[PDB]
Amino acid sequence: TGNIGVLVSRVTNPFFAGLFDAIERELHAHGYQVMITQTYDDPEAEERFLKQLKSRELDGVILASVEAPDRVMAVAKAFPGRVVVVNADVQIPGATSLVLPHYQATRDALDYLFNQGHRRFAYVSGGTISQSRTQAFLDFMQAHQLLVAQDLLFGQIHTAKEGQAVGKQLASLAPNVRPDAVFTNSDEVAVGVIDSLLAADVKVPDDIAVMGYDDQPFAPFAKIPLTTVHQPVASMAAAATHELLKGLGRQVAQDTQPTLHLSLKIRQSA
Amino acid sequence: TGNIGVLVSRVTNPFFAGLFDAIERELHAHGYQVMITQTYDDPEAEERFLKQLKSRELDGVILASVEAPDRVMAVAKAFPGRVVVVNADVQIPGATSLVLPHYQATRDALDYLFNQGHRRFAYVSGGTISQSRTQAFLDFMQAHQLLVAQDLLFGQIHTAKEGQAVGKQLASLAPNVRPDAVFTNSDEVAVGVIDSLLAADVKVPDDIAVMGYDDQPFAPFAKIPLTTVHQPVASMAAAATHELLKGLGRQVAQDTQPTLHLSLKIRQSA
Numbered sequence: 001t002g003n004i005g006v007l008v009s010r011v012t013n014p015f016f017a018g019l020f021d022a023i024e025r026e027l028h029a030h031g032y033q034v035m036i037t038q039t040y041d042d043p044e045a046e047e048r049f050l051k052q053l054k055s056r057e058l059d060g061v062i063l064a065s066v067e068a069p070d071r072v073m074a075v076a077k078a079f080p081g082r083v084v085v086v087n088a089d090v091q092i093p094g095a096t097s098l099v100l101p102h103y104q105a106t107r108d109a110l111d112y113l114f115n116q117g118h119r120r121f122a123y124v125s126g127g128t129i130s131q132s133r134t135q136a137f138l139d140f141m142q143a144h145q146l147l148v149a150q151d152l153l154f155g156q157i158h159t160a161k162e163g164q165a166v167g168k169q170l171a172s173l174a175p176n177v178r179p180d181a182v183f184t185n186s187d188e189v190a191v192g193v194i195d196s197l198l199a200a201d202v203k204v205p206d207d208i209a210v211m212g213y214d215d216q217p218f219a220p221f222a223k224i225p226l227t228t229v230h231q232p233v234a235s236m237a238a239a240a241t242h243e244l245l246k247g248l249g250r251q252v253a254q255d256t257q258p259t260l261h262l263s264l265k266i267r268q269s270a
Numbered sequence: 271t272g273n274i275g276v277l278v279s280r281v282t283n284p285f286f287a288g289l290f291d292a293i294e295r296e297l298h299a300h301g302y303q304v305m306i307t308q309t310y311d312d313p314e315a316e317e318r319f320l321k322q323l324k325s326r327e328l329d330g331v332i333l334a335s336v337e338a339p340d341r342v343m344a345v346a347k348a349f350p351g352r353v354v355v356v357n358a359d360v361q362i363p364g365a366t367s368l369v370l371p372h373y374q375a376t377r378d379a380l381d382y383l384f385n386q387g388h389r390r391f392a393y394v395s396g397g398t399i400s401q402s403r404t405q406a407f408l409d410f411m412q413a414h415q416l417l418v419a420q421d422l423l424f425g426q427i428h429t430a431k432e433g434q435a436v437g438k439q440l441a442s443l444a445p446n447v448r449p450d451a452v453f454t455n456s457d458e459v460a461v462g463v464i465d466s467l468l469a470a471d472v473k474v475p476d477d478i479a480v481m482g483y484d485d486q487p488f489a490p491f492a493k494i495p496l497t498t499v500h501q502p503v504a505s506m507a508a509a510a511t512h513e514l515l516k517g518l519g520r521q522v523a524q525d526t527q528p529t530l531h532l533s534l535k536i537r538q539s540a
């Protein structure tokens with residue numbers, strides 16, 4: 001039982017740090033040494049990480065972020081059983097790939113908000129908005145015949161500091177053009193957004209409701225405890241770990257599969 | 271420019287995740303691939319990590335936690351220039367070692383609290399209390415002829431969940447045996463402690479003041495924004511990175527040294 005690599009976009013994202021930790025503690029118990037690499041979504045960093053498998057510095061890898069699916073596919077084909085992909089919004093041929101239902105969770109979270117009476121929506125993403133979650137948002141807006149306001153779309157927003165800038169801009173707006181609710185796609189971003197709203201005496205949720213994503217460790221402890229979409233970190237980590245161990249010939253196949261569920265966690269911020 | 275390893279106790283501690291990130295972004299710019307391993311303070315995990323250098327899977331290592339100084343010393347002696355130690359409360363012969371002034375910072379933070387009128391102190395540590403910070407606490411209590419209450423000492427407390435248990439216990443106490451202030455040694459622990467105090471209607475800071483440690487990213491965003499000791503993550507990461515690069519022959523010596531300073535950050539929780 002040798003070395004395993006885990007690839008994530010950003011280690012300072014507490015969702016990725018938690019996911020790594022859960023994988024690592026279980027693999028460590030099986031005798032493996034586990035190391036994490038971060039990409040900041042650079043495909044060259046992903047390529048370089050994959051060379052560690054190709055050169056057999058690593059016995060296996062678990063990817064939680066994927067930049068170039070076809071490159072991952074080629075490595076998985078050369079190294080069957082040794083590449084697992086988890087919660088990356090993609091199925092990679094040759095690699096056991098676990099996809100969670102982010103489209104459904106996003107539609108459900110948006111339905112929730114609409115049901116609280118919210119009609120003007122800001123949407124924040126880590127990607128450039130021009131993507132299961134973004135399609136869920138667009139589908140949602142179409143279904144309720146709500147006009148998408150481009151002024152309330154925010155792309156490439158990943159951190160709490162970036163969320164602070166978004167919140168400061170939203171707090172600046174006249175009450176009649178201010179969104180009713182903000183879909184942040186990140187508990188980090190949500191904490192920042194909310195902090196800026198409160199600094200400007202914008203009430204949360206009564207003036208602007210803010211929906212998080214992930215249910216990160218800080219979420220229940222936030223100044224306005226976060227309403228958010230809970231990612232089942234422990235369960236997905238266990239599933240990914242088992243798929244890799246099975247592929248490495250360490251573990252037997254099991255009958256009982258997890259169904260990995262995202263769930264809406266209602267607290268105070270929305 | 272090859273592979274570098276970074277060793278930390280726990281990746282889900284946002285101080286270690288930040289420290290890694292700052293080191294990694296700078297090394298990445300220099301052409302290195304950087305990977306993090308966590309020990310959970312297990313000396314066998316440290317040993318195993320060091321074998322990656324001994325076998326030259328890695329070109330160099332940066333340790334932010336150390337379990338067995340004499341083993342680290344032996345590796346550093348065999349691999350001169352390739353082992354750097356940062357903020358681990360220890361100088362390792364053979365390894366460039368950067369020690370920050372935690373004794374002074376702790377004494378200063380405690381002096382602050384005493385100056386706010388606090389006289390009954392709870393002290394929380396990640397270690398078993400039977401350690402620059404613990405000695406600072408004992409020195410402090412001796413200097414003010416304050417009797418150390420064993421009932422208000424809490425060891426092996428690392429996480430927000432563990433801090434919640436501590437806070438729930440403190441909130442349970444009769445006002446006359448309740449501490450005036452809690453020195454938590456961790457912003458994670460502080461968030462948990464404070465959350466439990468507030469759940470029990472114990473006012474923070476007016477009933478119990480809570481001092482954090484690290485000035486983690488969540489600190490200013492906490493329900494009661496944290497008064498804490500700020501670790502200079504970016505500066506220490508830069509210093510450690512430069513020492514490793516110099517040792518690897520990539521960088522020239524510089525005249526201008528950082529003096530790495532810990533500073534007391536006053537917000538609301540104390």
Ligand SMILES: [Cl-]
Nearest residue numbers: 087089099100
């Ligand atoms: Cl997914």
Ligand SMILES: [Cl-]
Nearest residue numbers: 357359369370
């Ligand atoms: Cl130190």
Ligand code: NA
Nearest residue numbers: 180206207208
């Ligand atoms: Na409203």
Ligand code: NA
Nearest residue numbers: 450476477478
């Ligand atoms: Na008091």
